Design a protein around this nucleic acid. Structure first.
Ligand code: MG
Length: 438
DNA sequence: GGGGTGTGGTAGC
DNA sequence: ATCGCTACCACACCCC
């Protein structure tokens, strides 16, 4: 056990935090793409008619945690057993669940206690540990297979287990759904072989958003082909409102109230006006949804296809620790902040940049929230506070940055014993050139 | 027209 | 027990 005031707390928390792994893997995938392609030209022109194949593993962690499970779990059955991947027993997040578990209405993000109660008696939840290193290797095999197929002109990494693959269709070639079925089946078979038993599903379409929706419809272990020319009431009636990219619980709730609680995108599609959309959720998001309900991508989402190198270039660097934060005094907070900056400055040296603006964010116990929340070591119910600060000369100097961060903490006025979470950000990054003379 | 800030939402498992 | 990260866009409100 390593507590927030121990020197090794940052290292142990990140080794254990799957959310860190997700983010660290994404970042490495993004930088890897930029490296492979520094000399190649990674763009899709407006000259190109293209097909989008949106690929991702079916219940990634659960699948892989099963396939590499320890001897204690040799007899458990991925097709009959409700399986979750989690650290703990009570208020531990279900990082991933197989589709047997979902049949009982369980979803990721749910706590293990909550999911235990949606099972009939006698049916027992299986809880698998995380296998991070195997998660990596299976992902490597995933992207290695996608490249070896030589059927894609651009392979965009979305996630450790998710990629958007772009096929350019010359106008001499007449695309057909038969040929698209055969590609999906090739891809699915080849990743099944290359990953020793992991299955992917594929959405296939002539827009990013319809490929995202097709993919939801393809799950589990299948594929779906739906171009703009194939749209139908049957299609839209199949999706919830928060199946739309950009629509999370907050946008959902706003949409639900403005539009008489639509229960499908088909419901949404018939009742909506562009301006009532914009009014309900916002101008840019409203437009994105409007375009989306026609099967069309917006200008912001098309950028990744036109200039992936710019969209995938890292613009900020940060850490976030909102679990395990329990400090008795201001000295321990300052030393933790210093470990934080030291960590971020290593990462910042790796990418050979300086930073010219930094931010500190914190979570403070709500005045009426219990000192110890339901989730062990959780941040609990919190107000957030943020404050940023421009540096004069861009820099990678620990002395300047750690001093300013501690100053920022101090302007925020949060007693060490009320602290429940900390973020440390480098907001603007500046390249280091061969010229360094003033 | 151009800056700026802090805040809030969303995405992957 | 339990590991509630992190990048990025958008917005609302401020300034000369
Ligand atoms: Mg959604």
């Amino acid at each position: 056990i390593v507590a927030c005031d121990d020197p090794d707390f940052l290292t142990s928390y990140f080794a254990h935090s799957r959310l860190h792994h997700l983010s660290a893997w994404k970042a490495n995938l993004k930088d890897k793409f930029l490296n492979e392609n520094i000399h190649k030209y990674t763009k899709i022109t407006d000259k190109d008619t293209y097909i989008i194949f949106h690929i991702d593993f079916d219940c990634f962690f659960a699948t892989v945690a099963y396939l590499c499970r320890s001897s204690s779990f040799s007899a458990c059955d991925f097709k009959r057993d409700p399986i979750v991947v989690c650290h703990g027993t009570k208020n531990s997040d279900i990082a991933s669940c197989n589709y047997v578990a979902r049949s009982y209405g369980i979803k990721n993000g749910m706590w293990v206690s909550q999911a235990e109660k949606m099972l009939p008696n006698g049916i027992k939840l299986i809880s698998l540990p995380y296998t991070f290193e195997q998660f990596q290797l299976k992902s490597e095999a995933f992207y290695s297979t996608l490249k070896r197929l030589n059927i894609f002109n651009l392979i965009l990494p979305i996630s450790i287990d998710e990629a958007v693959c772009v096929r350019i269709i010359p106008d001499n070639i007449h695309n057909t759904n038969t040929l698209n079925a055969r590609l999906c089946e090739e891809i699915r078979q080849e990743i099944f072989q290359g990953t020793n038993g992991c299955t992917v599903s594929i959405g296939c379409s002539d827009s990013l958003v319809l490929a995202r929706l097709a993919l939801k419809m393809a799950k589990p272990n299948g594929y779906n082909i739906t171009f703009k020319s194939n749209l139908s009431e049957e299609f839209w009636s199949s999706f919830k409102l928060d199946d739309l990219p950009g629509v999370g619980h907050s946008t959902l709730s706003r949409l639900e109230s403005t539009f008489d609680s639509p229960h499908s995108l088909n419901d949404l599609r018939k009742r909506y006006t562009l301006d009532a959309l914009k009014a309900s959720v916002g101008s840019k998001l409203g437009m994105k949804i409007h375009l989306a309900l026609q099967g069309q991508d917006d200008e912001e989402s098309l950028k990744i296809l036109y200039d992936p190198k710019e969209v995938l270039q890292r613009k900020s660097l940060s850490i976030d620790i909102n679990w395990g934060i329990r400090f008795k005094n201001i000295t321990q907070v300052d030393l933790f902040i210093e470990r934080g900056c030291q960590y971020l400055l290593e990462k910042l040296n790796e990418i050979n940049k300086t930073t010219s603006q930094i931010t500190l964010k914190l979570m403070r116990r709500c005045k009426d929230a219990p000192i110890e929340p339901p989730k062990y070591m959780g941040m609990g119910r919190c107000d957030s506070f943020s404050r940023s600060s421009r540096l004069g000369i861009p820099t990678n100097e620990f002395g300047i940055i750690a001093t300013e961060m501690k100053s920022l903490y101090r302007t925020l006025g949060c007693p060490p014993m009320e602290l429940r979470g900390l973020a440390l950000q480098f907001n603007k990054l500046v390249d280091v050139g061969p010229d360094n003379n003033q």
